[model samples]
Target chain A: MVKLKNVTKTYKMGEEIIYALKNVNLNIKEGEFVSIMGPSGSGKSTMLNIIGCLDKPTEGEVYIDNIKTNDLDDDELTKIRRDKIGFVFQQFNLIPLLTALENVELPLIFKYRGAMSGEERRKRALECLKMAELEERFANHKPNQLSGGQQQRVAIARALANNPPIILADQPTWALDSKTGEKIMQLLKKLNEEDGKTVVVVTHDINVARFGERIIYLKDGEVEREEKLR
Target chain B: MVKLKNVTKTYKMGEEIIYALKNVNLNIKEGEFVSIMGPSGSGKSTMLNIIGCLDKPTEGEVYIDNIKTNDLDDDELTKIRRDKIGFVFQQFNLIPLLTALENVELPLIFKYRGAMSGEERRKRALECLKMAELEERFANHKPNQLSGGQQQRVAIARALANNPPIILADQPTWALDSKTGEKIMQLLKKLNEEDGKTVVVVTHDINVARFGERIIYLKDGEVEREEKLRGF
Candidate 1:
């Protein structure tokens, strides 16, 4: 449900300009599993940021289900991000002070604050944590209190907090052991296959790219290759 | 240089005691690559804390270089932890307000605070950052400014600031991509193989266990099994 038409992004580095993305054209249908791969300084992350509505390209247009994103204001972008997009970061960006349960509840609070009751919020957050298999141990633990795998699983639960139609995971398995990373990737794959959520992951890992139904390889800020897995 | 004998730890839960470790015994040479593995609440971390001198076992004795850890006072434990052992946590735990360079300089600051000139501290910190392979692009950046892998590397640099003989890593690769995680493992392995530094990691992943020269599997606070690789 996201489209990027000739999108380009440029950055100023000292006296020279760097192209982060060059004339990138992409279309992601709903319920598709996609992975973007590139080396350092390639525009993989930039493309995901644009798709997540967190950034603006220097050129071309982006459309989310035919809605032109270029003309949308900050409030509209925030709304779209809150209601339609879920993000899993490689850093496990849970607030250190908050308990795992509270961290998962954050995005949902942003989406359903006035609409849901305190009890409803707690229930939904607990449900998401359960799905990530962290409900039993992590509900009361702070970010520092849990193991790295536990913390990453908590991050995954937070990504599903809003049950958004689209999920953007930027190196979600980067900070995990191989087994833990594989388990997480399988969870994302299952989410895409069973739940029909549109999943897009930006990674430099061949293992991560292998799990996707479609893979896009970027080089020098442009799409260098594309592979269809399914 | 670390030894644990019949160590047991328990926590009170509404007047009921939850045994984190039952009875554990472990020993490491002066320079060893060791990994501890177990499921959640199996006491792997409790064992690490005891060995790191960060915590005392509820029962039994711990010795670091023949010094009875349980007999030491709080300040003594703090001194040993500061001077003899380094720690790499899962969270990176870098101060948000400090730049990567400043974070690396922290341990040295504690030891030589008013003795060294500002220039000296900066140079020493720069050296450590270079060792961690993160001197560029992260010198002035705050914790948020760097990526996750970069932040953890900076933490590693900080941990090695004191040049401690032993490094205790609690899931050091937990927050990195496989590529970055492998890089970190290689760094740690190099520290042990080339530098002869003792490294102990508490992890749940079998892959992490493979990196260690010795593996201790813990179950309900006891050493369930131990495996050792041939000398490097």
Candidate 2:
């Protein structure tokens, strides 16, 4: 569950006062699938960053399951991001030098530190890859060796490495082909339906946005419309 | 003009023979705007690499402007690539520490060596950036400081810095949102139409593929079909 009340994010550029987000009020229920769509500078990414605890709002309060995130310190915010949120990027931001399995194990190593042994981390990483429907033999290959769709699957597996309840994907299928994009959308939907994870995707493609149960359109830092289908 | 005659690229992965490209024959004119589309592992990228002179085929010959490319040495290939081809990658590939203007100046610096002064390079880079429709004030910003669309504009500026006849872009809009993606596609289209520069783009989106005057579809390392659209 997430709630944003009167959120505002502003940036001062010389003589210009730019409002990236303006008085935004939004709520996302647990296990919900939502999509955010807008033009280039419409603050879709800004809103997603605020929701994911990656950024702070210039005004108003953000509550994650009733916990006020506004007063949290840097360490507290980092903890929240680590434990409650998972992020996927359009670039499939896997480290190029690391193998698929090692890339997925990185977050677990960071979050659990010495508590998770090497074997435990590998086991969990492999399990996540299996959930993503990737073959075990491909786990040792580097990012460049895999196709775009396969690289995205590895990123999803890494996102699921921590088993966070919320998954925030920023144009997850932008680099993939149409059929590959469909498979990724289906995987995200499955995560919401079967795993009960709250999934949020920010995209410009109408076809991609339609995969969500609700679509929120933003324009000029404000909500333009909200569409709900079934 | 570019021509690929019986180009075949094969790789042996242990005991498995991978046909990345299979006896592909293609021709693109000097001022043509073409798009290559296919699913993953369809050899679209492989074909692009061969056309761009970044890679060589294991079999057959490649010709650019009727010059056979198979016999060129490494130095000759480098010179040809530098003089005739401009590449725009999906990641932008701008150096992180350099400002936008400096990134655009890179190819010119490499090509001219000490022949051109710093002021001359700066002027040319600024001109290319203007052609890309980027604001003058943002020219000094680093790649990380700019947005995804802006960074790509800078990459296009860099590609055009040398005024090469051909522009090769691989998934240039992959990291951008829809509106930004359209701006990039339009920029590429303008380059092909107004400047008469040969433009080749490899994309997965139909909207992007439609920008090209001709679309070449690939499947299983071979040409599946080709479609030609109107001048628009």
Candidate 3:
């Protein structure tokens, strides 16, 4: 479970102060498929960044599975994020020169501390790729070599490489067409249903928002509405 | 004008020969917005690479402005590409850790012979950013600080920095939402209509292909069909 209490994020621009998030409070339970939607400059991403531990809220208490993120130091926060969360970005965020398999194996290399061997890493990465339904035909291709849909699938595989409980996807299907985007959403839904994972997508598309078990709409750095699906 | 005559591109993959493009022929007129569509391993990107002068065809000739590309060496090809072609990739390919303005200015710096004054470079870069409709608000932000759409717009500004005649976009909208993708397509369409710049987008999305003046559909490294618009 995750909770945010009185979170506020502000930025100073020349002579103006920008409030990206202001006094936001929310609670998310385990194994929830949640979607956060907002317009541009609405601070949806700011909230996700705070939840992902990529940035600290200007003033708030964040709890990730009962551990207070506000009280954790930099190293502790990083370690927690690495072990407990995975992220998918709109851009796919895969290294261009590296192959799909290599990209999926990247987090493990950084996390295992020599605990997993090359064979184990390769096996686990390839298994995740298969779970995403990408055939071995694309195992060796670099990011440039794959289609947009294929690249997003690879990113999803990479997100699952660590088998983390919570996956934070920032507009995973934004860059894709409707058909391709639907395919991606279906893949995420399958992961959530079959694997019992917590999948949170931050998006602006109403179509995408409908795919979540719970929808949180944000405006002007605060929660505007919440819709829970039956 | 541009034409590819029986273009064939082959790669040596660890002793195995892979034919990326197989006897392909296509013609694109000046100021045409064309889209190349295909599945993975269908040679869409290979055709773009050949047209962009980034890679050479193994058994064919590429003509840009009626000039044969095969006859040119690496330096000549480099010079021609620098002067005539721009490129946008799916990843945005922005240099991380560099500010938005700095990333846009990078290509210009390397294209020019020597380093100009810092202020001059920054000014020109800011102008390019302005052309992309990005204001001064996010100029100093790094790649990580900007949104996905903003980073891509910055990439577009960088591609247009030199004002090349032809823009080669390799899945430029592959990482944006529907609204953001439409916005980017509109920007590219505006450039093609108002500025008369030619654009070739290689993508797998049929929706993206419909926006083009011409559509080249490929499968298994061969051209399946070519559809030309009324004006084209």
Candidate 4:
């Protein structure tokens, strides 16, 4: 569960205070699929960052699973982000020189700090890649060697490597074709439904937003409206 | 105008000769907007590459304004591609170290062989960026500093730098949100309608495909169907 109370994020640009998020209050239950939709400069990304613990709100408190996030130190917040949350970015953020399998294994290696055996890490990474539906032949290929869709799948597999309880995706399907985007969305849905992971996506496409059971619209750094569909 | 006659692109995989593109014929008149749609491995990219002069068909003749491309040497082909066609790629493909304005000026620098002054290049680059609707503050930012949609606008601005009559985009909106993607499509449409530029895009989103005046569907390296909506 995630909750934000009176959260506000502001930026100072030459004596001008620009509010990226203005007094937003939100609560997301466990295993919920939520989509945050907004136009550019609407603060949708700021909300996502605050919820994922990657950013601190300028004024307010954020609670993750009943714990006050503002009270935690940098190390503690980093641990929580590494252990409890998974992130899939729009840029596919894979290391250009590392192979696909290597990239997937990176999170596990970082989390466990060399506690995981080579064989175990490889097996787990391979499983994640399979879940992403990537071909075995591409396991050794670097990021540039793969297509845009394939690179995105590799990024998704890396996100699933640690098996975190919550998945935060920022425009995960932005770089993909329609069919590939649908497949990625289906994978996210399965993770929310079967695996009981909390899935939060930030998007602008109505088609992509429709995948969520609840849609939150933001405008001018405030919650404009909320829509519930099934 | 663009015409492809009996285009066939083949690739050697191990011991097999894979047909990336089978015998296909396509004609796109100037000032038309066309979209190519298909699943992965459908050779949609191959078709675009051939049309853009980025790749040559193994067994076919490509004609631009009734000039046979096969007869042109490598230098001539490069010159034609530089002067006549502009490309917008899916990945943005911006130079990591260059500022946004500098990246947009790259094509012009190459086309003119650095004959233009820095102030002139800057003026042109800013104009193109304004055409793409990006804010002026982003001109000094590197590619990594901008968002996905912002980077894409820079790519579009770069494509328009040469002022080519033909715009070839391979999923120009793939990395953008729906609203930003719609804006990019509208810019392309404006070019086709107002500037009389020939615009061809390869996309998988039906919404994006609908932006074109015609849609060409490819399946297994072959043209499955063609729909004309704007003109006969």
Give the number of the best model, judged by TM-score: 2
Candidate 1 ranges with C-alpha deviation above 4 Å: A4-26, A37-50, A54-62, A95-99, A109-123, A135-145, A173-183, A202-205, A216-230, B12-17, B40-43, B71-74, B112-114, B174-183, B203-208, B219-221
Q: Which candidate is the best by lDDT?
A: 4
Model 4: which residue pairs collide?
A: none
Please provide, for model 1 over B47-123, each residue's C-alpha lDDT reduced to its tens digit, 9 standing for 90 to 100.
Answer: 78888887888898999978888888899898888888888866678999999999988887775536878898888
Model 4 quality (TM-score): 0.84
- Model 3 superposed RMSD (Cα): 3.9
User: Lowest summed-lDDT stretch of 10 residues in model 1 chain B?
Assistant: B172-181
Per-candidate TM vs. native? 0.83, 0.86, 0.83, 0.84
Quantify all predictions' global Cα lDDT against the true fold.
0.80, 0.84, 0.82, 0.86
Worst 10 residues of 3 chain A by lDDT: A172-181
Winning candidate number (DockQ) = 2
* Clashes found in each candidate (C-alpha, N, C closer than 3 A): 7, 0, 3, 0
Per-chain TM-score of chain B, candidate 2?
Answer: 0.89
TM-score on B-chain, cand. 4: 0.94
Per-residue lDDT of model 3, residues B1-232, tens digit only:
7899999988775666778899999889899999987665578777887888889999988999778987799999988887788888666889998999999888777676776899999989998887665668888888877766678778877888777889889877654555656777787898899999999998755677777988888887999998886562
Question: What fraction of native interface contacts is shared by candidate 2?
Answer: 0.44
In model 2, residue pairs whose N, Cα or C atoms come closer than 3 Å (at least 3 residues apart or on different chains), thus clashing, are none
Alpha carbon deviation, residue A96, candidate 3 (Å): 7.3
The local distance difference test score of model 2 is: 0.84
Q: What is the lDDT of residue B124 in candidate 1?
A: 87
Which scores better on lDDT, 2 or 3? 2
